[PDB]
Amino acid sequence: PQITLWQRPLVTIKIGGQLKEALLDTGADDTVLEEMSLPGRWKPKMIGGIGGFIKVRQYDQILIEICGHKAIGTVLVGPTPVNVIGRNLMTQIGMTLNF
Amino acid sequence: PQITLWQRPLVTIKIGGQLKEALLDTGADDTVLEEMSLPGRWKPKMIGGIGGFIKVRQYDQILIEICGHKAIGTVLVGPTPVNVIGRNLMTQIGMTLNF
Ligand SMILES: COc1ccc(S(=O)(=O)N(CC(C)C)C[C@@H](O)[C@H](Cc2ccccc2)NC(=O)O[C@H]2CO[C@H]3OCC[C@H]32)cc1
């Protein structure tokens, strides 16, 4: 389907048994979510955007479910003010920008 | 045209008669550009990014061409890692997310 940009493109994802609302963000290289517990090992990382950098924990090979599609990708967990689904995951569901 | 998300959706924009590279950002409500000169008066605006809030200069009804398409709207100037084209301008050029 087609998703208009008149409003923030929000979606609900399924990750680690939890349901979280997130923003389909083409400007985000990776998916970034607010603090939560995830299984597996992680690496510390610093990501920057408007307002500066925040420290996050990088988890790779995490199973996520969006709109019925089951995809695997990297999830950065940290003090982000808003949950965003990055390009890392959007490519997996075949999402593109069109005009 | 269709833009996949394997790489950053960087495009060429024209503003003030100059060509610049900008990122198509669906997670951004507004368009935020790196320091540059724009005509007329500006108003203050407080925007919150991943790293916190910053003060930017708001210029309205500015002509800006994105991927060859003519737009006339609000452009915010301030400290940002890269020129960001937000939903305010993407809607003007008929851009949408598809999958
Ligand atoms: C490595 O992985 C990364 C993932 C995400 C980011 S990032 O979040 O700083 N970024 C990147 C953008 C600022 C270049 C995504 C932007 O779309 C970012 C996502 C976001 C963060 C906090 C609150 C709302 C929206 N949007 C953003 O800064 O938008 C600015 C400009 O328009 C306004 O909309 C609300 C916030 C304002 C950085 C790195």
d(CA B10, CA B84): 9
Binding-face residues of A in 37-76 toward B, CB within 8 A: 47-54, 67
Q: Which two tokens stand for residue B37?
A: 């000169």
Asked if the C-beta of A24 comes within 8 angstroms of chain B's C-beta atoms, the answer is yes
This PDB structure is determined at a resolution in Å of 1.5
Report the DSSP beta bridge partners of residue A46.
Answer: A55
Whether B83 and B24 have beta carbons less than 8 Å apart is answered as no
Report the DSSP beta bridge partners of residue A27.
Answer: none
Closest by CA position to B87, among listed B19, B2, B27: B27
Overall number of domains in chain A: 1
A54 to A50, A80, B77, B89: CA distances (angstroms): 11, 8, 22, 27
d(CA A95, CA A93): 6
A30 is catalytic: no
Of B9, B25, B53, the CB nearest to A51: B53
Q: How many CA atoms lie within 13 A of A13 on its CB side?
A: 28
Of B50, B84, B99, the CB nearest to A81: B50
SS3 A93: helix
A58 to A4, A23, B97: CA distances (angstroms): 31, 19, 26
Closest by CA position to B42, among listed B14, B71, B13, B74: B74
Q: How far is the CA of B49 from the centre of ligand 1 (A)?
A: 5
Residue A34 falls in which region: left (phi positive, over 0), alpha (psi -120 to 50) or beta = beta
Domain of A92: which CATH number? 2.40.70.10
Q: Give every CB contact of residue B84 below 8 A, 6+ residues apart in sequence.
A: A27, A50, B22, B23, B25, B28, B31, B32, B33
For chain B, the first-to-last Cα distance in angstroms comes to: 14
Experimental method: X-ray
Which helix H or strand E contains B87, and what residues bound it? helix B87-90
Ligand 1 pocket, mutate which of A84, A85, A87, A88 (most atoms under 8 A from CB): A84
Q: Which two tokens stand for residue A5?
A: 């940009």
Strand locations in chain B (E): 2-3, 10-15, 18-24, 32-33, 43-49, 52-66, 69-77, 84-85, 96-98
> By residue range, what is the domain housing residue B64?
1-99
Whether A22 and A85 have beta carbons less than 8 Å apart is answered as yes
- Burial of B20 (C-beta count, 10 Å sphere; 0-12/13-18/19+): middle
SS3 A77: strand
